[PDB]
Amino acid sequence: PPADGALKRAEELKTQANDYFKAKDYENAIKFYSQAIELNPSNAIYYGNRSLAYLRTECYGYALGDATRAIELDKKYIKGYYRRAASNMALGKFRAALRDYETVVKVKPHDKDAKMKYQECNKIVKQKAFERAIAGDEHKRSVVDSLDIESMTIEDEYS
Amino acid sequence: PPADGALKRAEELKTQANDYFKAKDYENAIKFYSQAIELNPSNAIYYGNRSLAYLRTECYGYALGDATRAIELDKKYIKGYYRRAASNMALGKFRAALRDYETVVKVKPHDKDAKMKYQECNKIVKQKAFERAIAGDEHKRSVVDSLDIESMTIEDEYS
Amino acid sequence: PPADGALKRAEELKTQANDYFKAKDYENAIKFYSQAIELNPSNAIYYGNRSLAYLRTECYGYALGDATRAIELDKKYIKGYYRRAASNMALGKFRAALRDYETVVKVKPHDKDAKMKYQECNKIVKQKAFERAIAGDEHKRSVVDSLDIESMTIEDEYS
Amino acid sequence: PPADGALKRAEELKTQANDYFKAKDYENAIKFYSQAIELNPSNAIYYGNRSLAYLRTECYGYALGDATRAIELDKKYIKGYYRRAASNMALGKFRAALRDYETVVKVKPHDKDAKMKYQECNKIVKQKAFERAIAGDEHKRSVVDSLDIESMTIEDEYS
């Protein structure tokens, strides 16, 4: 389950796919990670790989799907968390991504790598709140400048 | 309380101030609404007027203060609500202003005036959420374009 | 391309899938829309259907991918726009969804249906800005209440 | 300008006010900082003090006005920047306040005090973006849970 035969042929197709991947032929790499998945539908690495192949051809919905599956299959396959983080950044969901970089930083406490990624990301989350504030600042200046104070009137009636 | 004498002189100074106001001499209009206030410290109209005099010389903190006082004194002096709305727009607190335009629209249901102001304002509240979204959209496009997918790696280890 | 033979068998598998779909067997419906896609990889309806099958089993990344493909294949297959809108709502990207409901409302101007969907959506976009404002209001009240004004000091030095 | 006489009496009234301030009698402290201001209208400390007296009685618009004036009069009277920061926090304009705490931190680089205030504030700016995100997260969960996927339909027409 699969027979040792589906397991061995799935491992060949995966290699075939890798070749195609390293040679920039994504269409074929995706085609072959898929066959390997048909035969060994529970191998997290295949999904991790195909997810990346999907990130390289800008298919962010597919990559996210493949990334979540990898994590459903092996809760402790780190790259699944990197593939999902990458898919969510591409989809613009930066805080969802930060959640995954955090997870990795927690299990690889001294991996300078994890730290770097999570930093880049927390940064991008803060620059977003930044660009938004400025725009709100820029807009306020324009409203205030356009305020019709001149047409306002003093109470010209007894008091 | 005040003596009929403080009441009558307060009404003269108020007029003196109005003159100065209509003649664009804000420094003096403020000087005289103040004297009228010293003598009749509970007249809402004086505060309403001085608030406006403060909006005309860009003193938004003073105008807001004078506007809140007018409303503390006569809960149903409409202009106090317009002075406070105007002060909060200038201070960039658009939703606080909208709250006041709403109040006026509720008591003057058919005053096309109230409707117009409240419309301008709800609009400015929506344009703000707009400019902010765009900026967030613009920033996302730039993050996604800069995402280092190329340095990501396929699992090059047995699986 | 495909041979009339792949075209006819793809249309059977699609039906097989539909059966499985209407009988709530999503795992099998997905399995069969896929075979139909292997044989007729350019049929937008198959993708539209599989996308929905993906929305029903909560696989929002896959559904979005299948929805974008349907739109790449037939720019004027409306449901593709509904599948993509639905996938983006589920993914929390409400404004991206609104963009698609708008497109449909523009080509089906009198379809009360299009209007209804786009209304639900513009509403959800406005309720989001709402819940966010309140939370910001609630937080401000708490900061202001906690402000240490009492420890502030008057200038106790000559002036 | 003023005559040495207005200068000396203004300094007495200021003291009178301080007494009233330290004895929690704000109404009178405000009354006397005002007289001192009438006689020496250009003394920044009087404004700084009255601003605080205004923060203590919750008159945030007046305090902000008095704080800006103090800064117009003596660009390097630090407390003016603390009074304005305090008025803007109370008014909910946290980032405007942060701007002032930054200014002070820049001229008093080693004043642990400046650092502490600016920290409290940058924190409050970040907790606000926080409470807002959560609310947006909470709302998304509810939309997604309410999404009518069940009424969606597979294409039941030839393809």
Side-chain angles (χ1 to χ4, degrees):
Chain A
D4 260 64
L7 295 170
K8 181 69 173 167
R9 181 74 183 119
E11 196 60 21
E12 309 186 343
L13 288 167
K14 182 224 69 192
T15 288
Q16 281 200 240
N18 287 357
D19 284 358
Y20 279 122
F21 185 92
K22 285 172 289 189
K24 314 297 186 180
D25 184 6
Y26 305 125
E27 25 146 32
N28 266 319
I30 288 170
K31 168 193 177 164
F32 289 116
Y33 288 128
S34 297
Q35 279 172 216
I37 286 168
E38 311 311 276
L39 302 171
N40 184 358
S42 67
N43 193 346
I45 285 71
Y46 295 169
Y47 282 102
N49 289 352
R50 196 176 63 187
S51 171
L52 179 56
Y54 273 130
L55 296 172
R56 293 278 219 272
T57 46
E58 297 170 358
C59 293
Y60 311 127
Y62 284 144
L64 187 262
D66 272 352
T68 306
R69 192 70 196 125
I71 302 177
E72 293 177 355
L73 295 166
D74 191 14
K75 287 308 199 70
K76 259 189 187 177
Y77 178 49
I78 308 303
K79 296 222 180 189
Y81 297 93
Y82 282 158
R83 301 297 199 247
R84 194 165 61 192
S87 308
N88 275 326
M89 294 290 292
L91 287 169
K93 302 181 53 177
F94 307 159
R95 298 168 48 235
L98 188 66
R99 284 184 263 259
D100 277 339
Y101 290 127
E102 181 181 291
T103 290
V104 181
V105 169
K106 276 186 285 207
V107 37
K108 285 186 175 174
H110 313 114
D111 177 30
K112 7 62 201 184
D113 212 331
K115 301 178 182 316
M116 209 181 324
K117 278 166 184 167
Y118 178 87
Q119 257 83 107
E120 145 205 287
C121 182
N122 196 13
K123 198 178 156 198
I124 295 175
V125 175
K126 286 170 177 178
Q127 288 171 352
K128 185 191 184 157
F130 192 91
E131 313 278 12
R132 279 174 64 100
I134 296 292
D137 281 358
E138 196 55 70
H139 173 241
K140 168 206 168 155
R141 291 179 225 141
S142 304
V143 173
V144 183
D145 277 12
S146 301
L147 289 173
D148 191 36
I149 289 157
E150 201 48 71
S151 292
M152 293 183 178
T153 48
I154 222 67
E155 187 63 90
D156 252 319
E157 273 147 72
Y158 175 74
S159 72
Chain B
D4 260 64
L7 295 170
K8 181 69 173 167
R9 181 74 183 119
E11 196 60 21
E12 309 186 343
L13 288 167
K14 182 224 69 192
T15 288
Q16 281 200 240
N18 287 357
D19 284 358
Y20 279 122
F21 185 92
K22 285 172 289 189
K24 314 297 186 180
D25 184 6
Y26 305 125
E27 25 146 32
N28 266 319
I30 288 170
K31 168 193 177 164
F32 289 116
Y33 288 128
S34 297
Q35 279 172 216
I37 286 168
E38 311 311 276
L39 302 171
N40 184 358
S42 67
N43 193 346
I45 285 71
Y46 295 169
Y47 282 102
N49 289 352
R50 196 176 63 187
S51 171
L52 179 56
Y54 273 130
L55 296 172
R56 293 278 219 272
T57 46
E58 297 170 358
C59 293
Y60 311 127
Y62 284 144
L64 187 262
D66 272 352
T68 306
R69 192 70 196 125
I71 302 177
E72 293 177 355
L73 295 166
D74 191 14
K75 287 308 199 70
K76 259 189 187 177
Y77 178 49
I78 308 303
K79 296 222 180 189
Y81 297 93
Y82 282 158
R83 301 297 199 247
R84 194 165 61 192
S87 308
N88 275 326
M89 294 290 292
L91 287 169
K93 302 181 53 177
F94 307 159
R95 298 168 48 235
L98 188 66
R99 284 184 263 259
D100 277 339
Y101 290 127
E102 181 181 291
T103 290
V104 181
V105 169
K106 276 186 285 207
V107 37
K108 285 186 175 174
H110 313 114
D111 177 30
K112 7 62 201 184
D113 212 331
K115 301 178 182 316
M116 209 181 324
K117 278 166 184 167
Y118 178 87
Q119 257 83 107
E120 145 205 287
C121 182
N122 196 13
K123 198 178 156 198
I124 295 175
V125 175
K126 286 170 177 178
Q127 288 171 352
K128 185 191 184 157
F130 192 91
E131 313 278 12
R132 279 174 64 100
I134 296 292
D137 281 358
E138 196 55 70
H139 173 241
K140 168 206 168 155
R141 291 179 225 141
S142 304
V143 173
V144 183
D145 277 12
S146 301
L147 289 173
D148 191 36
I149 289 157
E150 201 48 71
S151 292
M152 293 183 178
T153 48
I154 222 67
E155 187 63 90
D156 252 319
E157 273 147 72
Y158 175 74
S159 72
Chain C
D4 260 64
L7 295 170
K8 181 69 173 167
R9 181 74 183 119
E11 196 60 21
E12 309 186 343
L13 288 167
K14 182 224 69 192
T15 288
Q16 281 200 240
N18 287 357
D19 284 358
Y20 279 122
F21 185 92
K22 285 172 289 189
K24 314 297 186 180
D25 184 6
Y26 305 125
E27 25 146 32
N28 266 319
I30 288 170
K31 168 193 177 164
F32 289 116
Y33 288 128
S34 297
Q35 279 172 216
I37 286 168
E38 311 311 276
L39 302 171
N40 184 358
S42 67
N43 193 346
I45 285 71
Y46 295 169
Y47 282 102
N49 289 352
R50 196 176 63 187
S51 171
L52 179 56
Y54 273 130
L55 296 172
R56 293 278 219 272
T57 46
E58 297 170 358
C59 293
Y60 311 127
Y62 284 144
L64 187 262
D66 272 352
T68 306
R69 192 70 196 125
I71 302 177
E72 293 177 355
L73 295 166
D74 191 14
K75 287 308 199 70
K76 259 189 187 177
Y77 178 49
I78 308 303
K79 296 222 180 189
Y81 297 93
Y82 282 158
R83 301 297 199 247
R84 194 165 61 192
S87 308
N88 275 326
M89 294 290 292
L91 287 169
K93 302 181 53 177
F94 307 159
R95 298 168 48 235
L98 188 66
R99 284 184 263 259
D100 277 339
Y101 290 127
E102 181 181 291
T103 290
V104 181
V105 169
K106 276 186 285 207
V107 37
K108 285 186 175 174
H110 313 114
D111 177 30
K112 7 62 201 184
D113 212 331
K115 301 178 182 316
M116 209 181 324
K117 278 166 184 167
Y118 178 87
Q119 257 83 107
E120 145 205 287
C121 182
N122 196 13
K123 198 178 156 198
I124 295 175
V125 175
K126 286 170 177 178
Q127 288 171 352
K128 185 191 184 157
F130 192 91
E131 313 278 12
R132 279 174 64 100
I134 296 292
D137 281 358
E138 196 55 70
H139 173 241
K140 168 206 168 155
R141 291 179 225 141
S142 304
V143 173
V144 183
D145 277 12
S146 301
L147 289 173
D148 191 36
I149 289 157
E150 201 48 71
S151 292
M152 293 183 178
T153 48
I154 222 67
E155 187 63 90
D156 252 319
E157 273 147 72
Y158 175 74
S159 72
Chain D
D4 260 64
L7 295 170
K8 181 69 173 167
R9 181 74 183 119
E11 196 60 21
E12 309 186 343
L13 288 167
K14 182 224 69 192
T15 288
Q16 281 200 240
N18 287 357
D19 284 358
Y20 279 122
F21 185 92
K22 285 172 289 189
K24 314 297 186 180
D25 184 6
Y26 305 125
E27 25 146 32
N28 266 319
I30 288 170
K31 168 193 177 164
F32 289 116
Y33 288 128
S34 297
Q35 279 172 216
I37 286 168
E38 311 311 276
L39 302 171
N40 184 358
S42 67
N43 193 346
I45 285 71
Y46 295 169
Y47 282 102
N49 289 352
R50 196 176 63 187
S51 171
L52 179 56
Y54 273 130
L55 296 172
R56 293 278 219 272
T57 46
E58 297 170 358
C59 293
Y60 311 127
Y62 284 144
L64 187 262
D66 272 352
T68 306
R69 192 70 196 125
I71 302 177
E72 293 177 355
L73 295 166
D74 191 14
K75 287 308 199 70
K76 259 189 187 177
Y77 178 49
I78 308 303
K79 296 222 180 189
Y81 297 93
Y82 282 158
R83 301 297 199 247
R84 194 165 61 192
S87 308
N88 275 326
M89 294 290 292
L91 287 169
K93 302 181 53 177
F94 307 159
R95 298 168 48 235
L98 188 66
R99 284 184 263 259
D100 277 339
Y101 290 127
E102 181 181 291
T103 290
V104 181
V105 169
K106 276 186 285 207
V107 37
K108 285 186 175 174
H110 313 114
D111 177 30
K112 7 62 201 184
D113 212 331
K115 301 178 182 316
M116 209 181 324
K117 278 166 184 167
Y118 178 87
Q119 257 83 107
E120 145 205 287
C121 182
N122 196 13
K123 198 178 156 198
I124 295 175
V125 175
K126 286 170 177 178
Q127 288 171 352
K128 185 191 184 157
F130 192 91
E131 313 278 12
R132 279 174 64 100
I134 296 292
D137 281 358
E138 196 55 70
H139 173 241
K140 168 206 168 155
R141 291 179 225 141
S142 304
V143 173
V144 183
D145 277 12
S146 301
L147 289 173
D148 191 36
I149 289 157
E150 201 48 71
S151 292
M152 293 183 178
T153 48
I154 222 67
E155 187 63 90
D156 252 319
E157 273 147 72
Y158 175 74
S159 72

